[PDB]
A paper describes a structure:
The average temperature factors of only 24.1 Å2 and 19.5 Å2 for the amino acids of chains A and B, respectively, indicate an overall well defined conformation of the 66.3 kDa protein structure. The crystal structure contains seven N-acetylglucosamine moieties (NAG) in total, which are part of five N-glycans at the asparagine residues 93, 115, 236, 441 and 520 and are well defined in the electron density map. The three N-glycosylation sites of the 40 kDa fragment surround a prominent cavity – the putative substrate binding pocket – in close proximity, while the remaining two sites are localized on the opposing side of the protein molecule. Additionally, two intramolecular disulfide bridges are formed between C147 and C157 of the N- as well as between C497 and C500 of the C-terminal fragment. Non-interpreted electron density was found at the sulfhydryl group of C249, which is the N-terminal cysteine of the 40 kDa fragment. This sulfhydryl group appears to be partially oxidized which could be a consequence of the fact that the 66.3 kDa protein was purified and crystallized in the absence of a reducing agent. C249 was modeled as cysteine sulfonic acid (OCS). The oxidized side chain of this N-terminal cysteine is involved in the octahedral coordination of a cation, which is additionally bound by the side chains of S246, E328, T330 and Y379 as well as by the main chain carbonyl group of D315. Since sodium acetate was present in the crystallization buffer and due to the absence of a peak in the anomalous electron density maps calculated with diffraction data sets collected at a wavelength of 0.8 Å, 1.7 Å and 1.9 Å as well as the results of fluorescence scans (carried out at BESSY BL14.1, data not shown), it seems likely that a Na+ cation is bound to the protein. This is further supported by the octahedral coordination and metal-ligand atom distances of 2.7 – 3.1 Å.
Residue numbers in the entry:
A (entry chain A): 63 to 238, 245 to 248
B (entry chain B): 249 to 592
Write the structure that this text describes.
Amino acid sequence: VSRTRSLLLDAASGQLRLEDGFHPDAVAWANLTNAIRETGWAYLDLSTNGRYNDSLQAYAAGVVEASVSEELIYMHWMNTVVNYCGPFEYEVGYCEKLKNFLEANLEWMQREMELNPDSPYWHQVRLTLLQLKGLEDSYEGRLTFPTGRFTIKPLGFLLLQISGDLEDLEPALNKTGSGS
Amino acid sequence: CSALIKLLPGGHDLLVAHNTWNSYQNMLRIIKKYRLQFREGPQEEYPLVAGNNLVFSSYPGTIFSGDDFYILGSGLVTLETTIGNKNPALWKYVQPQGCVLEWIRNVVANRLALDGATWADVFKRFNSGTYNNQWMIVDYKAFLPNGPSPGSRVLTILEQIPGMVVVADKTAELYKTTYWASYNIPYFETVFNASGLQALVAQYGDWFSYTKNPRAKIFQRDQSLVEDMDAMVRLMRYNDFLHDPLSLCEACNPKPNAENAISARSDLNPANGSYPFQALHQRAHGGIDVKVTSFTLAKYMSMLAASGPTWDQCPPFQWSKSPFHSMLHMGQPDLWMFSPIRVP
Ligand SMILES: *[C@@H]1O[C@H](CO)[C@@H](O[C@@H]2O[C@H](CO)[C@@H](O)[C@H](O)[C@H]2NC(C)=O)[C@H](O)[C@H]1NC(C)=O
Ligand SMILES: *[C@@H]1O[C@H](CO)[C@@H](O[C@@H]2O[C@H](CO)[C@@H](O)[C@H](O)[C@H]2NC(C)=O)[C@H](O)[C@H]1NC(C)=O
Ligand SMILES: *[C@@H]1O[C@H](CO)[C@@H](O)[C@H](O)[C@H]1NC(C)=O
Ligand SMILES: *[C@@H]1O[C@H](CO)[C@@H](O)[C@H](O)[C@H]1NC(C)=O
Ligand SMILES: *[C@@H]1O[C@H](CO)[C@@H](O)[C@H](O)[C@H]1NC(C)=O
Ligand code: NA
Ligand SMILES: [Xe]
């Protein structure tokens, strides 16, 4: 019903490592209480540590979130997007267009960040995408904190974030959720 | 999605509520509380962002709300209902370069904003023309219990379609009418017209009208009965489609339609019914939650929240006793009969 995990930075090795329980020295920690059977909700509480820079905090936030919610992520993926643009998809035209659109959009953001290292706006965008990268990396069980550019998979955990955006991307890309 | 911002009699409180409509297969839910220490800019000298603390309704693996409903430590509550776009001539404004996807713009605006005006300023940059919503930004820092209208700052409304974002402070209007309701139709006439809704009103009638659609009429009839949090929950869960004249669809057979409610139950419409357009069909889709907060609750980063389709006057949804028993719903309860809880 409940699980707590912290992400530590081993200064010795410079390696990030997950530990069970609460370690307020860690870069981040989270705990999840699953009360779905009783209330229809689970509850996640997550904190990051201001002693580390915000890029590392953001990546760590994704990591610890995935770490305490892996089961729920798997089930939600299966319930909602497991078939979306899969290996047997009939609409190969649309799926290729979508993938191309997302890859180009992600690349464009990475370029803007590189071109604007002093921008507050692009700093906030980078924090958001670092959190997404940490969520996926942690779910896949292999951590790698990027100090420069990084590649978000167009059809990985990005798909859990773009359900609303897809309501419009579909017709915009001529394909043949939330709202009315 | 349906939303209601309600000034209680005498200005005693200001309640904000949102009811997500979504597919039933999406009902694995997580309420998330983040306490971050991010800074406004890439150097340690920058101030901490305004939105480092936030509580929001969400889903597994989803690092924003999606509903959307957020209570921010900056004193803002942000929420939206989706308006979409029906004008294909605007799709040319959806481009991979020069557009940031809406979920990112939402997260960044929530982090940086100190007030409604700044939220709008941040959010509207690099408008993607995707997840086109009417956003409501309530700034509780501008709300004085029992006070008269401050004229500005309390409520900001933003509407996005591809190529166009319109923003206005609607504090005076909120104080004049005592509420602001939202129900998937744009308020701004320029947005309503640009997004192709006039053709839909011409073809199908008042269901697509901003002022005359069923939810608009139900809020007009009933919003004044919201005199407290519990009354808010009751309205936001409201669906009595078999008996409410406002739920009748004259073009449908049968005429009562379970989509025509504050909290839709499309699973209850018959599969062999005759319907003029897809939204009115039997569907495994409808209102799936309600979240409500108030001036005091928001101050304590708290809300009342209820999970699952409405069962106040409709029979509770149950997967195994529905037309949809074969759909994947791993991890979900079979029967959905939950009551609101205080969170945290
Ligand atoms: C934020 O702090 C992290 C952790 O100290 C920094 O990451 C190190 O960056 C250097 C390269 O500059 C690498 O040699 C180390 O391997 C990195 N550590 C880890 C754990 O990957 C990082 O440079 C700081 N700044 C930013 C923007 O991330
Ligand atoms: C939005 O579109 C509507 C519908 O075309 C416009 O309303 C029409 O306006 C003209 C000129 O005033 C009238 O002669 C028509 O009778 C109106 N038709 C209606 C009310 O359905 C409206 O002016 C447009 N609004 C904006 C702000 O562009
Ligand atoms: C996380 O642990 C803290 C420790 O005090 C507890 O108070 C809180 O209820 C827990 N939250 C969750 C999501 O289980
Ligand atoms: C979609 O189809 C229209 C033709 O009506 C075309 O003009 C447009 O370029 C197409 N969009 C994409 C992204 O394929
Ligand atoms: C429609 O289906 C319902 C549900 O089984 C059935 O009772 C009713 O007879 C049907 N009406 C028509 C027109 O078939
Ligand atoms: Na929505
Ligand atoms: Xe985008």
